[PDB]
Design a protein around this ligand. Structure first.
Ligand code: RTL
Length: 135
């Protein structure tokens, strides 16, 4: 059953993000800036169609996709690499593979109550982010 992500979700915690960005070959200044920044996720869900807006004062990162489709994702801000990205529905878990340069590149996102729980992977290394629903 595909879970309803429609809303504005504010960050509670950010765990292992400097090690995830070091696994993408990112500079030390952008690792310290992006681990100090707490973004707001605005998600608009329409069945398989999804707009995920990761909102911040330094850079806003918007992912627009249909679940099912392998799309051209430029990760502009993070590392600036083009991945062939396929996102699939496992009921509660929204499960993604990013096809390109890195070993086991992807992400898994799910709802626990009012909390969005995100795992992001690059070269095995998993960053864990928690966001609470407010509007
Ligand atoms: C570089 C960078 C950032 C990294 C954003 C990332 C890594 C977003 C990932 C979003 C996902 C995985 C969406 C699909 O569920 C943010 C905007 C925080 C702060 C400014 C610099």
């Amino acid at each position: 059953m595909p879970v309803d992500f429609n809303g504005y979700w504010k960050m509670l915690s950010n765990e292992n993000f400097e090690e995830y960005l070091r696994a993408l070959d990112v500079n030390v200044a952008l690792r310290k800036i992006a681990n100090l920044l707490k973004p707001d996720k605005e998600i608009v869900q329409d069945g398989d169609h999804m707009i995920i807006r990761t909102l911040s004062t330094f850079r806003n990162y918007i992912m627009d996709f249909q679940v099912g489709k392998e799309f051209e994702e430029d990760l502009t801000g993070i590392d600036d690499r083009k991945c062939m990205t396929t996102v699939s529905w496992d009921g509660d878990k929204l499960q993604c593979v990013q096809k390109g340069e890195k070993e086991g590149r992807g992400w898994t996102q799910w709802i626990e109550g009012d909390e969005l729980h995100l795992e992001m992977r690059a070269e095995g290394v998993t960053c864990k982010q928690v966001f609470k629903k407010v509007h």
